[PDB]
Design a protein around this nucleic acid. Sequence first.
DNA 1: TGCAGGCGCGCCTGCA
DNA 2: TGCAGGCGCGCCTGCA
DNA 3: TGCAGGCGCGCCTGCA
DNA 4: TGCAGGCGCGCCTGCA
Lengths: 120, 119
Amino acid sequence: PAVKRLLGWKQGDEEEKWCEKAVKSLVKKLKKTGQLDELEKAITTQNVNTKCITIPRSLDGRLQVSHRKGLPHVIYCRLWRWPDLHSHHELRAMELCEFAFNMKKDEVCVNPYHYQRVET
Amino acid sequence: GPAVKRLLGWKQGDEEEKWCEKAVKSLVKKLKKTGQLDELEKAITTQNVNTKCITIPRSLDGRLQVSHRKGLPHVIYCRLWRWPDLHSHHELRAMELCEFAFNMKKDEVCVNPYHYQRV
DNA sequence: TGCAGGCGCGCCTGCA
DNA sequence: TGCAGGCGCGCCTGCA
DNA sequence: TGCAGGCGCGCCTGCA
DNA sequence: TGCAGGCGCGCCTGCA
Ligand SMILES: [Zn+2]
Ligand SMILES: [Zn+2]
């Protein structure tokens, strides 16, 4: 009771506010392209055989979320799988991943379960 | 909105939100024992600077440990309820009204966030 | 309900 | 020297 | 010198 | 509907 009341008054940190901004950014795109269910299926079931969850690729490959840039597959693999993920060099797509980042296609797959972490 | 909160619950960087709950649980347990919990809720919800000092015992080095993390008690609770980007105790100055301020080295340390001003 | 295991303050080490 | 961080004994908690 | 980060126009939201 | 304001991708800049 008092603990949960006092916790509600907590000033929110920028990292949690940014994570929410990162998830809202992806959800808005997936909703528009009919891919939101697949993201929830991939995240909650950890199923590697899920479809590619794609977003359009930018000219430099970077994605901006609340004044912060990063590679989109790296942003969402750090979010749902490896918080200590340093760079794209630590990621390796599976053969089944049609839209892997490394392939530089029109769309980029951000399904965290289509990438394997390597120790570079 | 429902999908965003659902998907957010699945994130991996949850090390900091479980800690804030442990930090609040730690303070509440001490304030209930000493009859000061209502004053904390009055200070937090009303932002009233003229609230009474909300004290906890002071340790030998002045640091407080919450779930394997150490910090100065007034800094911990000012960052929690007022300034998340609060860097160190050097950015805090107690109001003159505050009898149990951190810098006073007394037996009890006041952790009412509304008895400190940011500099 | 006895008791294994969690965790904090005090003690100590180790840099800048 | 201000500060960070590791870890044990004493205190406290939650099960079979 | 590669590349992180600043910032504007275009896009979009939201009031009157 | 005239207008304000938030923010990203594309463009551009400044360091270690
Ligand atoms: Zn894929
Ligand atoms: Zn005070």
